[PDB]
C-alpha cells in the first residue's frame, strides 16, 4: 500500500500521474526491493515460488493443444516463466550476469512471436507483453541502447495485435474485453516500463484509464457492488485490482474510490451452503466444483488489509499460473482471516444499483433472498432484470432462470438474445405490446441480428443493445432503468426483522407503460419451522389496457397451483426447500394463475422455445430451470396491482402461516404470523390520515410504508397509543409494536 510520491499534471483537464524517472517501477519500487529476501523466506510464499520454478519446464510436445487458447497462455510454462524468475533474481542479487541473461533470453522471441487467431488471444499477446515489460523494467540498467529500440519496437508490434487496437481506441471502458487484461494490466504495465524511451504508450493506456475507466468505476464504487454478474465478477474485478496495485506500486497511491474494498462482500453474502454462489447476470451452474473469487479476494484482501476477504482467498489459495508472480509480490501473509458468521444479515447496495441481499443465517439452514431495482443497466453480461427477486433455501426456490452456455451456444446464442438476458427469464413484470420492436444489431460478436424476440419485457438500451463507450456516453443516453424510492432494514441492524426496498422501474420499459413500481418486503420470521417470507407489491399502468400484463415466478421443478396458492418444491440433488406463494391481488375473481414448462416449454417466449440443454454432465441440478408461473388479470385494464406473499420452509413442513389481506381506506396490507406490513393503496405517498383493523392473538410488529416523512400519531380503538412517532425519509416508514384492535394514523 504506500503514500503517493509522483508528480501529477492535468492532461486535457484530467489529473494524471507521471511515472518516476527510476527503475524498478513496475509492480514494485526500489523501496520494497530489499524486502523480497524475507518473502522468499516466508513459507506461505515458499510454495508459491516452488510452483513457479515447476512452471519453468516446457510444454511436453505431445500435450500442446494445437488450438492455442487464452487458456493455453494463462497456463504459463517455459521460457517466459524463466525470464521473469531471472529478472526477479536480478532484483534480489544485483548480479550483472543474472540480469544480462534475462535480457538476451527474451529479446529475440519478443520481436518475432506470432499469434494464431483464437478465442481471446489478446490475453495471450497481452501476457507475453507483461513478460517483456518485467525484464525491461526490472533489468533496465543492463539494457544496451540498441536493445531498448528493439524492445520498444517489439512492444508496439505486439500492441497492434491487441483487440482494443493500438492506439487503444476500440471497444468499451466500463464493460467488454477492453475492461479486462488488455489495458488495465497489459498495456499499462508496458507503458510504465518503457516510459523513458517511448512515453506515448503510457500516455495512451493510462490516458484512457484515468479519463474513462476510472471515472466510470468511481461512480458506482460507493455502493459496494459490481454489474457484470457473479461469474464475470472474477475477470473484471480482478483487472480493476491489477490497475489498483500497479499504480500504487508505481507511486500514485490508490487512484480508486476506497469503497472498492467492499465490493466483494456481495459475493460473500451470495455463497450457498452447497459451495455454489447465488445466480445473477451471465452464469452457468455446477454442483461439482465450488466457485471461488481467488484473485479478487487476494488482490483486494491484501491491499485493503481486509480479513473477511482474506478468509475468502484462504478457501482456495490457488492462483492461475500467470498470476503466481503477483501472489508472490503482493500477497499479505501476515493479514488474518474471519468467517462471515458475525456479519449483519442484510446488506444494501445504493445508487446506481438499489439491491438488497437478505439472509437468516450463515449456516446450513440459511434463507438467501435478493431484491433488485437497477437504477441503470451496464449491458454486456448484465441482464434486463429490473425488479427481479431471487430466493434460495436448501436449494434454489424462486429462480433466476436460463443458462449462459448449452446446446444453444454461448454469449451469441439465440438463448442469450431471446431469453437469458431478457426480462422473461426473471421473477419480474411483463407488459406485452404486440407492436414493440427490440433493436439488437450491435449485440455480441457473432451471428448478428437487427432485432431480437418480443418477450414483453424491458427495452434493449444502447445503439442496438451495445454498451456505451464510457460514463459520459452512458449518462447522455438511454441506459437509465429505474429509481430507488425507499429502502431499509431493522429494527435491529444485526438481525433485522424485515428488509425493505422500493423502486420505480418505469424507465426500464418502452412508452407502453406510464408507471411501474415494485416494493419488496422480506421478513426474517426468526423461527425454525417457517424461517422467512417475502411480500411483493406492484403497480402497473399501461398506455393501453389491451397490453397483457404478466407477473412471473420461475422454478426448477413443476409448481402445483391450487386456487390462490402456488407450491414449489426441491426434491433433488439433496435440496429440500419449499416456496409457497399466496396470491392476494388480484383476488381470485380477477386472477389467472398458470404454469408453463416441461420439455419444449422451459425457455418459452410467446410462440417460440429457445432451447438450451446442458452439455452432458453439467448443471446436474438443472438450475437453468424448467418451469415458470404466470399471473395475469382476467379483466383488461390500464391499471393493475399485484400483491403476492411468499413463505419459505422445508418441503416436509405441513402447517405454514395463514395469510390475511388487510384492506383500509388509503392502504392495503398483509398480516402473517406476528408481522403486519402495509402499503399505500395506490403505491403513492400517503399524506392524509388513514386506518385499518387488526384481528388476531398476541403481539404484532407493524411496518407501514409509503408514508410522508414527518411526525405521525397512532391511535387504537379511539385512544392515543403512540402520541408521536417519526417516519424518516429513506424508508418513508413507521415501525412499532401493537396488539389487536382498530387503528388510525394521523399526520
Ligand atoms: C462489449 C461486450 O458486450 N462485448 C462482448 C464480449 O463480452 C463477448 O465475449 C464473451 O464474453 C467474454 C468476456 O467478456 O470475458 C469472453 C468470451 O470472449 C465470450 O464469452 C463477445 C463474444 O462474441 O461479444 C461481445 O463483443
Ligand atoms: Zn439472469
547 DSSP 8-state letter: S
Question: Which atom from ligand 1 is nearest to the alpha carbon of 380?
Answer: 3
- Which burial class, exposed, middle or buried, applies to 250 when counting CB atoms under 10 A from its CB (0-12, 13-18, 19+)? buried
Say how far apart CA 54 and CA 32 lie, in whole Å.
Answer: 26
Answer for the pair 503, 340: CB distance below 8 angstroms, yes or no: no
Instruction: Quote the cell numbers at residue 137.
Output: 523494467
Ligand 2 mean position to 233 CA, how many Å? 14
- Straight-line distance from the first to the last Cα atom of the chain, in angstroms, rounded to the nearest whole number: 53
- Which burial class, exposed, middle or buried, applies to 32 when counting CB atoms under 10 A from its CB (0-12, 13-18, 19+)? middle
* Residue 303 among the catalytic residues: no
Say how far apart CA 566 and CA 579 lie, in whole Å.
Answer: 8
Best residue among 170, 228, 380, 443 to mutate for probing ligand 1's pocket (most ligand atoms within 8 Å of CB) is 380
User: Would you say 459 is a known binding-site residue?
Assistant: no
| Residues followed by a gap in the chain, C→N > 2.5 Å | none
* Residue 177 among the catalytic residues: yes
Answer for the pair 209, 183: CB distance below 8 angstroms, yes or no: yes
Best residue among 445, 460, 468 to mutate for probing ligand 1's pocket (most ligand atoms within 8 Å of CB) is 445
Ligand 1 pocket check for 445: Cβ under 6 Å: yes
Cβ count near 542 (within 10 Å): 23
Ligand 1 pocket check for 176: Cβ under 6 Å: yes
Helices (H) and strands (E) in the chain, counts: 18, 30
Say how far apart CA 561 and CA 580 lie, in whole Å.
Answer: 10
702 DSSP 8-state letter: E
State the catalytic residue, choosing from 177, 213, 415, 657: 177
Ligand 1 mean position to 407 CA, how many Å? 18
Backbone angles phi, psi at 621, to 5 degrees: -95, 5
Smallest Cα–Cα separation from 453: which of 399, 413, 481? 413
Backbone angles phi, psi at 132, to 5 degrees: -65, -50
Which residues share a beta bridge with 483? 504
Which residues share a beta bridge with 568? 579
DSSP 673-684: TTEEEEEETTSS
Ligand 1 pocket check for 235: Cβ under 6 Å: yes
202 DSSP 8-state letter: H
Ligand 1 pocket check for 120: Cβ under 6 Å: yes
Question: Which atom from ligand 1 is nearest to the alpha carbon of 467?
Answer: 1
DSSP 320-355: -GGGHHHHHHH--SS-----GGGS-SEEEETTTT-E
Answer for the pair 164, 170: CB distance below 8 angstroms, yes or no: yes
Ligand 1 pocket check for 380: Cβ under 6 Å: yes
Answer for the pair 345, 495: CB distance below 8 angstroms, yes or no: yes
Say how far apart CA 394 and CA 569 lie, in whole Å.
Answer: 10
User: Would you say 100 is a known binding-site residue?
Assistant: no
Ligand 1 pocket check for 411: Cβ under 6 Å: yes
* Residue 415 among the catalytic residues: no
- Domains, the chain, in order of start with CATH, read 2-331 (1.50.10.100), 332-651 (2.70.98.70), 652-747 (2.60.40.2750)
Ligand 1 pocket check for 741: Cβ under 6 Å: no
Helix spans in 569-656 (H): none
Instruction: Quote the cell numbers at residue 361.
Output: 443465517
Say how far apart CA 436 and CA 145 lie, in whole Å.
Answer: 64
Answer for the pair 163, 178: CB distance below 8 angstroms, yes or no: yes
Resolution (A): 2.3
Q: Kind and range of the H or E element at 204? A: helix 199-208
Ligand 1 pocket check for 467: Cβ under 6 Å: yes
Ligand 2 mean position to 378 CA, how many Å? 14
Best residue among 119, 411, 449 to mutate for probing ligand 1's pocket (most ligand atoms within 8 Å of CB) is 411
250 DSSP 8-state letter: I
Q: Is the peptide bond before 24 cis (omega within 30 degrees of 0)?
A: yes
Q: Kind and range of the H or E element at 746? A: strand 741-746
User: Would you say 282 is a known binding-site residue?
Assistant: yes
The residue assigned the cell 389491451 is: 546
CA dihedral 291, 296, 302, 303 (to 10 degrees): -160
| HEC profile of 438-490 | CECCCCCCCCCCCECCCCCCCCCCCCCCCCCCCHHHHHCCCCECCEEEEEEEE
Residue 660's Cα: distance from chain center in Å? 36
Query: Please, what sign has the CA dihedral across residues 378, 384, 389, 392?
Result: negative
CA dihedral 472, 477, 478, 482 (to 10 degrees): 40
420 DSSP 8-state letter: I
Say how far apart CA 538 and CA 614 lie, in whole Å.
Answer: 34
Helix spans in 270-422 (H): 294-303, 307-314, 324-330, 414-415
Instruction: Quote the cell numbers at residue 702.
Output: 407493524
Instruction: Quote the cell numbers at residue 739.
Output: 396488539
Collect contacts of 595-602 with beta carbons under 8 A, ≥24 apart. Answer: 595/558, 595/559, 595/561, 595/627, 595/628, 595/629, 595/630, 596/627, 596/628, 596/630, 597/555, 597/558, 597/625, 597/626, 597/627, 597/628, 598/558, 598/626, 598/627, 599/626, 602/626, 602/627
State the catalytic residue, choosing from 73, 166, 226, 232: 232
Smallest Cα–Cα separation from 434: which of 606, 592, 609? 606
DSSP 254-273: --S-GGGGGTTHHHHHTB-T
Q: Kind and range of the H or E element at 233? A: helix 233-247
- Which burial class, exposed, middle or buried, applies to 351 when counting CB atoms under 10 A from its CB (0-12, 13-18, 19+)? middle
Nearest alpha carbon, ligand 1 atom 11? 411
Amino acid at each position: 500500500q504506500t503514500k503517493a510520491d509522483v508528480v501529477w499534471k492535468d492532461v486535457d483537464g484530467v489529473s494524471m500521474p507521471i511515472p518516476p524517472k527510476t527503475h524498478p517501477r513496475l509492480y514494485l519500487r526500489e523501496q520494497q526491493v530489499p524486502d523480497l529476501k524475507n518473502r522468499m523466506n516466508d513459507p506461505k510464499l515458499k510454495k508459491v515460488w516452488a510452483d513457479m520454478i515447476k512452471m519453468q519446464e516446457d510444454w511436453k510436445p505431445a500435450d500442446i493443444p494445437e488450438v492455442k487458447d487464452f487458456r493455453f497462455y494463462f497456463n504459463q510454462k517455459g521460457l517466459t516463466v524463466r525470464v521473469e524468475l531471472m529478472a526477479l533474481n536480478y532484483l534480489m542479487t544485483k548480479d550483472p550476469k543474472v540480469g544480462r541473461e534475462a535480457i538476451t533470453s527474451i529479446i529475440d522471441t519478443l520481436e518475432t512471436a506470432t499469434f494464431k487467431p483464437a478465442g481471446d488471444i489478446s490475453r495471450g499477446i497481452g501476457l507475453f507483453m507483461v513478460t517483456g515489460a518485467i525484464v525491461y523494467d526490472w533489468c533496465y540498467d543492463q539494457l544496451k541502447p540498441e536493445e531498448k529500440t528493439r524492445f520498444v519496437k517489439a512492444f508496439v508490434r505486439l500492441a497492434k495485435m491487441l483487440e482494443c487496437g493500438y492506439p487503444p481506441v476500440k471497444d468499451k471502458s466500463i464493460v467488454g474485453h477492453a475492461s479486462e487484461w488488455m489495458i488495465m494490466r497489459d498495456l499499462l504495465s508496458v507503458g510504465i516500463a518503457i516510459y523513458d524511451e517511448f512515453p506515448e504508450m503510457y500516455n495512451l493506456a493510462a490516458g484512457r484509464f484515468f479519463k474513462e475507466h476510472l471515472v466510470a468505476r468511481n461512480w458506482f464504487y460507493p455502493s459496494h457492488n459490481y454489474h457484470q454478474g457473479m461469474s464475470y465478477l472474477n475477470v473484471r474485478f480482478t483487472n480493476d485490482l491489477f490497475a489498483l496495485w500497479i499504480l500504487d506500486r508505481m507511486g500514485a497511491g490508490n487512484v480508486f474510490n476506497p469503497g472498492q474494498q467492499f465490493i466483494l462482500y456481495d459475493a460473500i453474502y451470495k455463497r450457498r451452503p452447497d459451495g455454489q454462489i447465488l445466480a445473477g447476470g451471465d452464469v452457468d451452474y455446477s454442483r461439482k466444483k465450488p466457485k471461488y473469487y481467488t484473485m479478487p479476494a487476494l488482490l483486494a484482501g491484501s491491499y485493503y488489509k481486509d480479513e473477511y476477504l482474506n478468509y475468502e482467498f484462504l478457501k482456495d489459495p490457488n492462483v492461475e499460473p500467470h498470476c503466481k508472480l503477483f501472489e508472490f509480490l503482493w500477497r499479505d501473509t501476515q493479514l488474518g482471516s474471519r468467517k462471515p458468521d458475525d456479519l449483519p444479515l442484510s446488506r444494501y447496495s445504493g445508487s446506481p444499483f438499489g439491491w438488497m441481499i437478505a439472509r437468516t443465517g450463515w449456516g446450513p439452514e440459511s434463507v438467501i433472498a435478493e431484491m433488485k431495482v437497477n437504477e441503470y443497466s451496464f449491458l454486456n453480461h448484465q441482464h434486463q432484470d429490473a425488479g427481479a427477486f431471487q430466493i434460495y433455501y436448501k436449494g434454489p426456490l424462486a429462480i433466476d432462470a436460463g443458462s449462459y452456455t448449452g446446446s444453444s451456444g454461448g454469449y451469441n446464442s439465440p438463448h442469450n438474445k431471446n431469453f437469458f438476458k431478457r426480462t422473461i427469464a426473471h421473477n419480474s413484470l411483463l407488459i406485452y405490446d404486440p407492436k414493440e420492436t427490440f433493436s439488437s444489431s450491435g449485440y455480441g460478436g457473432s451471428d448478428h441480428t437487427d432485432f431480437a424476440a418480443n418477450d414483453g419485457g424491458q427495452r434493449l438500451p444502447g445503439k442496438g443493445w451495445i454498451a456505451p463507450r464510457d460514463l459520459k456516453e452512458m449518462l447522455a443516453g438511454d441506459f437509465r432503468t429505474g429509481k430507488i424510492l425507499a429502502q431499509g432494514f431493522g429494527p435491529d441492524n444485526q438481525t433485522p426483522d424485515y428488509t425493505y426496498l422500493k423502486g420505480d422501474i418505469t424507465a426500464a420499459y418502452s412508452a407502453k407503460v406510464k408507471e411501474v413500481k415494485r416494493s419488496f418486503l422480506f421478513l426474517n420470521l426468526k423461527d425454525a419451522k417457517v424461517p422467512a417470507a417475502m411480500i411483493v407489491f406492484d403497480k402497473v399502468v399501461a398506455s393501453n389496457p389491451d397490453f397483457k400484463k404478466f407477473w412471473l415466478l420461475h422454478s426448477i421443478e413443476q409448481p402445483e397451483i391450487k386456487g390462490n396458492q402456488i407450491t414449489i418444491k426441491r426434491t433433488k440433488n439433496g435440496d429440500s426447500g419449499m416456496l409457497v406463494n399466496t396470491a392476494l391481488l388480484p383476488d381470485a375473481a380477477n386472477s389467472n394463475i398458470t404454469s408453463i414448462g416441461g420439455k419444449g416449454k422451459d425457455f418459452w417466449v410467446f410462440g417460440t422455445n429457445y432451447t438450451n440443454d446442458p452439455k452432458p454432465g453439467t448443471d446436474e441440478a438443472l438450475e437453468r430451470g424448467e418451469w415458470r408461473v404466470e399471473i395475469t388479470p382476467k379483466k383488461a385494464a390500464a391499471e393493475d396491482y399485484y400483491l403476492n406473499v411468499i413463505q419459505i420452509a422445508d418441503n416436509t413442513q405441513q402447517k405454514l402461516h395463514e395469510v390475511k389481506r388487510i384492506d383500509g381506506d388509503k392502504v392495503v396490507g398483509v398480516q402473517l404470523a406476528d408481522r403486519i406490513v402495509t402499503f399505500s393503496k395506490t403505491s403513492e405517498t400517503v399524506d392524509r390520515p388513514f386506518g385499518f383493523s387488526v384481528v388476531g392473538k398476541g403481539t404484532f410488529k407493524f411496518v407501514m410504508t409509503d408514508l410522508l416523512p414527518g411526525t405521525w400519531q397512532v391511535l387504537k380503538d379511539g385512544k392515543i397509543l403512540y402520541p408521536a412517532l417519526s417516519a424518516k425519509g429513506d424508508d418513508g416508514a413507521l415501525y412499532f409494536e401493537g396488539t389487536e384492535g382498530t387503528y388510525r394514523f394521523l399526520r
